[PDB]
């Protein structure tokens, strides 16, 4: 990871599943990088400005990607009372 001197000797820092905090491999050819553009007060989408979610291929293949994404959106306050933390 970190050299004794203090240089980032590790090759590249990979992303992690924004839903399960699991690492996203290099050839994890099912993961998705969902973007959600911000909106201004009167209802326009600000270009080039967006929140990001990184969903691992595993959860997508399981079929629970929608539930995790919905939960994340409500935790970030992008959806109003759509997911229930008690089910």
């Amino acid at each position: 990871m970190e050299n004794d001197k203090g240089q980032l000797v590790e090759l590249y820092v990979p992303r992690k599943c924004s839903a399960t905090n699991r690492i996203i491999k290099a050839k994890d050819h099912s993961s998705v990088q969902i973007n959600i553009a911000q909106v201004d007060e009167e209802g326009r989408a600000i270009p080039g400005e967006y929140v990001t979610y990184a969903l691992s291929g595993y959860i997508r293949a399981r079929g629970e990607a929608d539930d995790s994404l919905n939960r994340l959106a409500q935790q970030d306050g992008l959806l109003k009372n759509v997911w229930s933390y008690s089910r």
């Binding site: 599943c17 399960t20 905090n21 699991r22």
Partner: protein
């Protein structure tokens, strides 16, 4: 029957982590399991876990964080001298940089690094990394 309650606990936590859950329900609770959980919580492999009283046997609800990859119990609580602990940490833990052999000493239930620092050794409970 249910022989090692902690084996059940750690099997449940490992299965649910592999499945992808964020919380588990350890069905029977015991002091040793609680101490195991405190160790993992202090080191950060677990989020915020909760005990529930039932007047028969406690239940535990463990909020994971996905940082954990695999726990595991060494079910025959073998005897390890202060010398063989290096052999055990070579056998179980992937690399010496991290990973902890959680074992019980006369000073308490505690990982192998703290145990080395206190210069005590006892019986092996499990391994977490």
């Amino acid at each position: 029957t249910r022989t090692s309650v902690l084996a059940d606990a750690l099997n449940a936590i490992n299965n649910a982590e592999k499945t992808g859950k964020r919380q588990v329900l350890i069905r029977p609770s015991s002091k040793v399991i609680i101490k195991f959980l405190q160790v993992m919580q202090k080191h950060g492999y677990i989020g915020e876990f909760e005990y529930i009283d039932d007047h028969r046997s406690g239940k535990i609800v463990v909020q994971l964080n996905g940082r954990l990859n695999k726990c595991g119990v060494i079910s025959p609580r073998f005897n390890v001298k202060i010398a063989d602990v290096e052999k055990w940490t070579a056998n179980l833990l992937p690399a010496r940089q991290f990973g902890y052999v959680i074992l019980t000493t006369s000073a308490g239930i505690m990982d192998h690094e703290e145990a080395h620092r206190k210069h005590v050794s006892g019986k092996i409970l499990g391994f977490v990394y």
